[PDB]
């Protein structure tokens, strides 16, 4: 309940001119008070129009400002020019930074003046520096300066925080003021004209530095931030890698004194096992070399901190190491040229001097894995393999982006990259030939996208024609079905939907065991991803062809084999100025349907071969092998306790055996912990890097500034949970900057706290960190209803596309492939489903989003005169709130701390009620209807759509299922079985869990079925209304958990809900009309 | 390994408790039993599957 | 068991090589239990077999 005050103070700060006026708008559910609100708003508008002060009106309508709820603030300012520089000159007292132009290997990566890199405006490109975020550097400077003004007169540790941040911002502000604040355009891009005489990386460096300095609280924070901010001005390439390198060894220096053990996808059983860390001298030499590299780059504080920690190598002081690791990733992205990044990726030294025996065994293992994955569906004539083309057509929405093509629908021309629209266009023009896989050779080389992650090297992505996806979809789906129940495939293994996000490596860690872990992210152009890998897959397909008598399955396998054959001899396109390089590339890359599963298969085969060779010199049992995306790790158990020499010998043997196959591996062997891309374990504890950048983005998103503010808050929450706390006031300042909309060049509307924190499509953040927003008061229900009224919007582009003959022809072909002939009713439902699937196209979704935002803005400019009987979640909670009695309770701490970087209050919740055991899926995946849908298409209807559908008539449900692509017989079986009667409860559970973010943020870490938690909830059971009991119990759990989060203490809840109230609420529980913005989903794991 | 005839070792003094701390030293015995309990927990194997 | 012929050949080859190389030994082949042994992996035996 602080956002509105901070907003008003920020408006005063940024519009300190004497002509600046803030007009606060209010709303109320009470008609008597709403009339006063309307009169107050009218009088404020009239006074501003006549230019009269509004102070007296705050006395005339002091009840409105008291009893009504603030809806927004209208700001009128007329002196906006050169305001940020006027504020900044105060903080530019320090010495500006001078870039070292001999730090980066590539010339254009040195932070020199833009003219020195792009002599003419035609040569200029901001792609190598673009923050790719819809917020300006001027806004970041304004937010930092507002924070400094607000906290200028703090005392105690607050004053120390202010002083540290003032020093860091003095650095940043002096550097920026030396050249002047560059001005963004409407697209938040920085043009050549405003960047000629500035350092090229000034804007992105300034954004990263502002984030870092606003993330500083302690002295160690200040030292790390100062070092990184000063060094990243000159270093743009190797700084993050330099700082993150030691961690891969540090995890191996901490003994385990008790640890966690994964059971099923989030369930941990805890061990009191003690394991000593066995570290050979070579590892210490490597760590010494890493620290020497740090110092050679100008680092003094970070290596000194690491050396100080190395005195004891204790897990209690390891949080500083985790802090350095997380901070390393906030020096921004490395958006080097596609040519250099690709050439780094496809830098290969292929040799004929490889071990033929090893390669033949590896190929045989790949063949065996493919056969194991696809034997049963191939032998039994699985429907998906019989209708592979139809399955691919139905699942096109889940395909990767193609290369942009000029499509025409009706009389409109578009430039979609969506493969479904490409299929539509080709069908309309007689170019749809699934049976032919286009070559990807020097005649039609593959265009390349890029995936960039801070610290990590850039990855190339194939952009293939849609025929590859059509050919590969069904086979890869069968592969994923197999891999979901295979524990070795960490990326895919899951009992229902959730992955082993904590990993499974600590179960077999012992004093007779060692864990070998290897980074394999650089094995895209390795010699083992060449002909051997593709030919192993081809041999598997050839074997599978003999196991089936269905011509359609054989044709599916033939098309998959043809895709592999074509990809064996493939070329890639890379632009370079005015010349396109066609580079031979017969290796693996993402952007193909099978890439993830195929990489897992190949890595498993390769590690099996390597371990087979390593068994020559040592006797051990391989306990587990896990291939988790960019990393692999295997646990080897020995008949003796592990010694230093054993660890060193195993590491050397693994490296040499991988080299025998021409694979360059840095084989890291430990006894106590590992470090992989998505987590690292040290001292029996698990850590996740908190490197999500806030003021910089990898690439320009297809969202709005509103949704980007929501994503900014979500990223801030995820970073905070992982141990990287940015000041919440700075985040709220950014939120108010990004959610404001210009009614005119002089008038700007700032939404209030209620607007932004309310559960709706417009939700951006929560008033309290880690607590889902809900409220039982009349105003909150009223505004939720009003916002729900604005959710439904149309798209003109979607309408024109759906009305075009191209879309109608596509729907007709889809229907005839679905065994319907001029049905006239089924076809219309299929057309609706395909029009919905068109929502993945960025212009359509953006048009809908902007329509919603515009409607919201029109509503916000006036007091909300909207009333409806529509039921929202706040209505349910208001109904059930009065019957809950609250008492003070106590829970002892009886659960282990396994995530040391969790915030203290979240950690308290975990210690008191425990961590999540098993997760109820948020999409209703384990409902009969959802399983039926997944049987034919990977398209996932939103849980809201399923919630609406499951309460319709039987024929309506049947028609919806047929539209999704389920055959009529199966849909009629589902409906006539009356299975929807049981399915509606699972659907309601998933719907409510989605609305209340039970599977997001900190809630995903909690156990909502904890015996300790349910010991605090006392709801006498009344049967035969499961929906009401479910919502009552979930609400009680949320209330208790949120109270503990906010206060750090516990409350018991008691609700003797009357039966009549239960029956009344039962009717409403199936008519809930509520939404929550997906942009507010804070996924702790990513 | 075949240990040489000239190899030596020192036997630990594993005499049973002469102080009988289990009798009337209830707090000391509580500490001892707590240490034994922690060690046993550390060595008890973890359930799997 | 099904590699009977190959194992007979392997045993004969190993014995013949041992005898032929033993013809070249000039110092008494004294059999003693040495302090340290040569570790042999039974997986290597499986590979040979």
């Amino acid at each position: 309940g602080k956002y509105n005050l901070i907003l008003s103070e920020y408006l005063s700060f940024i519009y300190n001119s004497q002509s600046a006026v803030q007009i606060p708008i209010y709303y109320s559910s009470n008609s008597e008070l709403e009339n006063r609100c309307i009169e107050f708003h009218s009088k404020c508008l009239e006074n501003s129009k006549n230019g009269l002060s509004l102070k007296k009106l705050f006395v005339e309508y002091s009840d409105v400002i008291e009893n009504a709820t603030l809806l927004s603030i209208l700001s009128y300012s007329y002196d906006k020019y050169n305001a940020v520089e006027r504020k900044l000159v105060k903080y530019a007292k320090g010495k500006p930074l001078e870039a070292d132009l001999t730090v980066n290997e590539l010339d254009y990566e040195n932070n020199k003046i833009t003219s020195e890199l792009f002599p003419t405006a035609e040569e200029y490109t901001d792609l190598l520096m673009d923050p790719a975020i819809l917020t300006s550097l001027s806004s970041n400077l304004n937010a930092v300066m507002f924070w400094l003004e607000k906290h200028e007169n703090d005392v105690a540790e607050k004053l120390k925080i202010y002083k540290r941040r003032l020093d860091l911002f003095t650095i940043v502000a002096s550097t920026v003021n030396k050249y002047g604040v560059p001005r963004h355009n409407a697209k938040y891009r920085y043009e050549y004209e405003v960047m000629k005489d500035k350092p090229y990386y000034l804007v992105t460096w300034a954004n990263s530095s502002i984030e870092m300095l606003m993330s500083v609280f302690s002295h160690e924070d200040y030292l790390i931030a100062r070092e990184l901010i000063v060094l990243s001005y000159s270093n743009r390439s190797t700084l993050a890698k330099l700082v993150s390198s030691p961690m891969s060894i540090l995890v191996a220096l901490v003994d385990i004194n008790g640890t966690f053990i994964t059971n099923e996808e989030l369930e941990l059983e805890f061990s009191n096992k003690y394991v000593r860390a066995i570290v050979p001298d070579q590892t210490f030499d490597e760590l010494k070399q890493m620290l020497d590299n740090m110092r050679k780059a100008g680092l003094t504080d970070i290596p000194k901190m690491i050396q100080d920690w190395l005195v004891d190598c204790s897990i209690e002081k390891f949080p500083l190491m985790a802090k350095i690791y997380s901070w390393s990733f906030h020096v921004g992205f490395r958006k080097q040229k596609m040519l250099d990044a690709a050439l780094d990726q496809l830098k290969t030294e292929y040799t004929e001097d490889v071990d033929d025996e090893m390669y033949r065994e590896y190929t045989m293992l790949i063949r065996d894995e493919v056969v194991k994955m696809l034997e049963e569906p191939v032998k039994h004539d699985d429907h998906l393999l019989q209708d592979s083309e139809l399955a691919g057509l139905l699942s096109m929405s889940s395909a990767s982006n193609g290369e942009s093509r000029q499509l025409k629908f009706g009389r409109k021309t578009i430039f979609s990259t969506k493969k479904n629209m490409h299929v539509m266009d080709d069908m309309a023009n007689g170019r749809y030939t699934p049976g032919i896989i286009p070559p990807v050779n020097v005649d039609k080389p593959i265009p390349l996208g890029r995936r960039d992650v801070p610290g990590r090297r850039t990855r190339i992505i194939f952009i293939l024609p849609y025929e590859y996806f059509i050919a590969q979809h069904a086979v890869v789906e069968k592969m994923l079905i197999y891999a979901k129940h295979t524990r070795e495939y960490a990326e895919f293994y899951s009992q229902s939907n959730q992955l082993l996000s904590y990993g499974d490596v600590t179960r077999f860690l012992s004093n007779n065991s060692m864990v070998l872990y290897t980074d394999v992210s650089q094995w895209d152009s390795s010699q083992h991803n060449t002909q051997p890998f593709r030919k192993g897959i081809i041999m598997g397909l050839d074997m599978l062809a003999n196991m089936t008598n269905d011509a359609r399955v054989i044709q599916t396998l033939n098309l998959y084999k043809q895709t592999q054959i074509n990809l064996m001899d493939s070329y890639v396109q890379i632009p370079d100025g005015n010349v396109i390089k066609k580079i031979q590339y017969g290796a693996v890359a993402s952007g193909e349907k099978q890439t993830k599963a195929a990489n897992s298969i190949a890595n498993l085969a390769l590690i099996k071969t390597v371990l087979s060779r390593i068994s020559n010199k040592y006797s051990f049992a391989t306990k587990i092998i896990r291939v988790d995306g960019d990393d692999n790790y295997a646990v080897l158990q020995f008949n003796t306790e592990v010694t230093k020499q054993m660890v060193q010998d195993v590491s050397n043997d693994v490296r040499e055996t991988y080299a025998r196959m021409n694979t360059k591996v840095k084989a890291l062997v430990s006894t106590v912990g590992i470090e992989i891309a998505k987590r690292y374990i040290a001292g029996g504890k698990i850590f996740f890097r908190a490197g999500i950048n806030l003021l910089n983005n990898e690439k320009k998103g297809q969202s709005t500034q509103w949704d980007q503010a929501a994503v900014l808050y979500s990223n801030y929450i995820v970073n905070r949970l992982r141990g990287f706390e940015t000041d919440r006031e700075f985040i709220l300042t950014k939120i108010m900057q990004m959610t404001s909309v210009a009614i005119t060049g002089s008038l700007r509307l700032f939404p209030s706290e209620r607007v932004l924190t309310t559960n709706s499509t417009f939700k951006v953040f929560d008033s309290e960190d880690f607590i889902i927003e809900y409220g039982t008061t009349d105003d909150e229900v009223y505004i939720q209803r009003a916002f729900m009224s604005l959710s439904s919007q149309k798209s003109g582009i979607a309408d024109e596309i759906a009305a075009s003959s191209t879309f109608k022809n596509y729907v007709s072909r889809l229907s005839e492939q679905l065994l319907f002939s001029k049905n006239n009713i089924v076809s219309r439902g299929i057309a609706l489903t395909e029009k919905a699937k068109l929502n993945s196209y960025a212009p359509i979704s953006l048009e809908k989003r902007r329509a919603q935002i515009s409607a919201l803005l029109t509503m916000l400019q006036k007091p909300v005169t909207f009333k409806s009987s529509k039921i929202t979640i706040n209505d349910i909670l208001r109904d059930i709130k009065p019957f809950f009695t609250v008492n003070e309770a106590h829970l002892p701490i009886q659960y282990q701390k396994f995530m040391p970087t969790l915030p203290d209050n979240v950690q308290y919740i975990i210690q008191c009620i425990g961590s999540r055991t098993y997760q109820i899926e948020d999409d209703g995946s384990k409902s009969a209807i959802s399983r039926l849908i997944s049987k034919y298409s990977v398209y996932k209807p939103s849980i809201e759509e399923l919630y609406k559908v499951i309460s319709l008539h039987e024929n309506e449900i049947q028609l919806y299922l047929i539209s999704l692509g389920i055959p009529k017989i199966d849909a009629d079986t589902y409906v006539g079985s009356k299975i929807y009667s049981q399915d509606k409860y699972r659907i309601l559970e998933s719907y409510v869990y989605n609305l209340l973010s039970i599977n997001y943020g900190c809630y995903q870490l909690f156990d909502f079925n904890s015996p300790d938690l349910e010991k605090l909830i006392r709801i006498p059971f009344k049967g035969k209304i499961p929906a009401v009991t479910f919502i009552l119990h979930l609400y009680a759990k949320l209330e208790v958990i949120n109270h503990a989060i906010k206060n750090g203490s516990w409350i018991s809840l008691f609700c003797n809900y009357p039966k009549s109230e239960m029956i009344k609420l039962w009717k409403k529980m199936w008519n809930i009309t509520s939404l929550r913005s997906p942009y507010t989903n804070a996924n702790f794991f990513q | 390994r075949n240990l040489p005839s000239t190899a030596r070792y020192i036997r630990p003094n594993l005499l049973q408790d002469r102080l009988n701390l289990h009798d009337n030293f209830e707090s000391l015995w509580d500490t001892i039993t707590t240490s034994n309990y922690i060690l046993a927990r550390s060595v008890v194997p973890d359930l799997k599957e | 068991s099904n590699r009977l012929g190959q194992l007979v050949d392997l045993t004969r080859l190993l014995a013949y090589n041992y005898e032929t190389l033993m013809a070249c030994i000039t110092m008494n082949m004294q059999h003693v239990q040495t302090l340290t042994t040569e570790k042999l992996q039974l997986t290597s035996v499986t590979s040979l077999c």
């Binding site: 220096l253 860390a277 066995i278 030499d285 010494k288 592990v642 | - | -």
Partner: peptide, 28 residues
């Protein structure tokens, strides 16, 4: 300055908490 890192490295190699049993070296 580098001598501090030298001492740190030597201590780490001879550190009590990272060493394993040494009987085989005694025999050898």
């Amino acid at each position: 300055n580098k001598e501090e890192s030298k001492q740190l490295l030597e201590v780490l190699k001879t550190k009590e908490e990272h060493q394993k049993e040494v009987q085989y070296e005694i025999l050898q």
